[PDB]
Amino acid sequence: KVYNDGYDDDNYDYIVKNGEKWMDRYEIDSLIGKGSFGQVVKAYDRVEQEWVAIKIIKNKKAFLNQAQIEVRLLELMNKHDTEMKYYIVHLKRHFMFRNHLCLVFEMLSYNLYDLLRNTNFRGVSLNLTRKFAQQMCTALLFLATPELSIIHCDLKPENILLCNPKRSAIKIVDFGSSCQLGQRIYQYIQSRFYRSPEVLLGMPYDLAIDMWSLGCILVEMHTGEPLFSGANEVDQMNKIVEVLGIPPAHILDQAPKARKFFEKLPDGTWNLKKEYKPPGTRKLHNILGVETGGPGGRRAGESGHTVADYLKFKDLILRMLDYDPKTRIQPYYALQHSFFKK
């Protein structure tokens, strides 16, 4: 009947009203996004004389506390990037309003999945993919600084926003599922398509999980389609194996969940448990179209898509997709890679 004295709906969300004034400061314009956490509204900040995005968290304890974690991490980050040069969304301030935690951010545009839809799921150019890659690796370098040691834990196209729909600048959003290296708590993390092998295998994890996700994202940005589109964990592992082969024995031998996906043979080697291409036969070389005109052959006869360019990109991606989190490429070295040698 009544939710939050009439201010909320039956989904724990604030009922947005165009033109409402809050706290003698914000005039709410319109709803511009929503998700599991709540809503995002465009509002005018009359004190600072600028448009802002306000993320209005659901009035529900689990969502509140998720956002409190997010606020703490954003405050830590923003504090160490006062010039806003490391591609993390800027939290301006926060407040509690009518039993909703509200996070005030800079305005941004839509996400990189919306950009892919805008390409009719045919992909962005290799040059634009490179610009996204360079910004993302720079962000991951900042998150790896020791005072931060932040693992985002949910990198996907939907959590990377354009600043402006006609430009390449991005910001990473949604630190609600994030953690710090000193303070890992979650066993179940990462959205499935972008989930690292160490997490699938129930093994220890660190900031390298975010690099795995980035490798997956960058291929998808150029092809238009997810690299590893599993329907469930077993399918996800099998799709990874089609491209990358059986994981190293030294890893599977230490993996609590190895036998969810694999079986250990009499000779000590590992094979898949019993519909899929044989291990390692779905070549990234062919998914990218390195020698055959890029994805779908559609980049044949276009500049900015040579065999040489594609071989650089393939090499970087394979380093991001190293099964071993100890040897998987780290942000500093990703930035030095020949793919970014203009």
Ligand X SMILES: O=C(O)c1nc2ccc(I)cc2c2[nH]c3c(Cl)cccc3c12
Please identify every residue annotated as catalytic.
Answer: 154
Question: What are the Cα distances from residue 341, in Å, to 131, 152, 184, 216, 285?
Answer: 12, 27, 36, 22, 21
Specify the length of the chain in residues.
342
Please state the closest distance from residue 325 (CB atom) to ligand X, in A: 26
Number of other residues whose CB lies within 10 A of the CB of residue 75? 12
Nearer to ligand X, 16 or 246 (CB): 16
**Positions in 43-62 near ligand X (CB under 6 A):** 53, 55
39 annotated as a binding-site residue: yes
Q: Of all helices (H) and strands (E), which one includes residue 271?
A: strand 270-272
What single-letter amino acid sits at 75?
E
Residue 156 engages ligand X in binding (rule: CB under 6 A): no
Residue 13 engages ligand X in binding (rule: CB under 6 A): no
Please state the closest distance from residue 89 (CB atom) to ligand X, in A: 5
CB 291 within 8 A of CB 299: no
What distance in Å separates the CA atoms of residue 113 and residue 224, rounded to the nearest whole number?
A: 9
One of 41, 77, 89, 290 touching ligand X (CB under 6 A): 89
Piece in contact with ligand X (CB under 6 A), picked from 22-30, 76-84, 102-110, 130-138: 102-110
336 annotated as a binding-site residue: no
Please state the closest distance from residue 163 (CB atom) to ligand X, in A: 9
| Among 137, 284, 283, CA closest to 219 | 284
Question: Residue with CB nearest ligand X?
Answer: 33
Piece in contact with ligand X (CB under 6 A), picked from 32-40, 72-80, 248-256, 332-340: 32-40
Q: Judging by DSSP bridges, how do beta strands 160-162 and 91-97 pair with one another?
A: unpaired
Nearer to ligand X, 34 or 285 (CB): 34
Nearer to ligand X, 35 or 165 (CB): 35
Residue 40 engages ligand X in binding (rule: CB under 6 A): yes
Q: Which residues pair with 233 in a beta bridge?
A: none
Cα torsion through 307, 312, 314, 315, rounded to 10: 140
One of 63, 86, 105, 132 touching ligand X (CB under 6 A): 105
Residue 328 engages ligand X in binding (rule: CB under 6 A): no
What distance in Å separates the CA atoms of residue 290 and residue 254, rounded to the nearest whole number?
A: 35
One of 174, 242, 309, 322 touching ligand X (CB under 6 A): 174
One of 15, 35, 204, 315 touching ligand X (CB under 6 A): 35
DSSP 16-63: --TT-EETTTEEEEEEEEEETTEEEEEEEETTTTEEEEEEEE-SSHHH
Q: Of all helices (H) and strands (E), which one includes residue 113?
A: helix 112-118
Piece in contact with ligand X (CB under 6 A), picked from 11-19, 26-34, 205-213, 224-232: 26-34
**How many helices and strands, by DSSP H and E, does the chain display?**
11, 12
33 annotated as a binding-site residue: yes
Piece in contact with ligand X (CB under 6 A), picked from 105-113, 225-233, 234-242, 299-307: 105-113
How many residues bind ligand X (CB under 6 A)? The answer is 13
What distance in Å separates the CA atoms of residue 234 and residue 273, rounded to the nearest whole number?
A: 10
Binding letters toward ligand X, positions 221-260, x by CB under 6 A: ----------------------------------------
Nearer to ligand X, 152 or 239 (CB): 152
Which residues of the shown chain bind ligand X in the complex (CB under 6 A)? 32-35, 40, 53, 55, 89, 105, 107-108, 173-174
Bind-site residues: 32-40, 55, 105-108
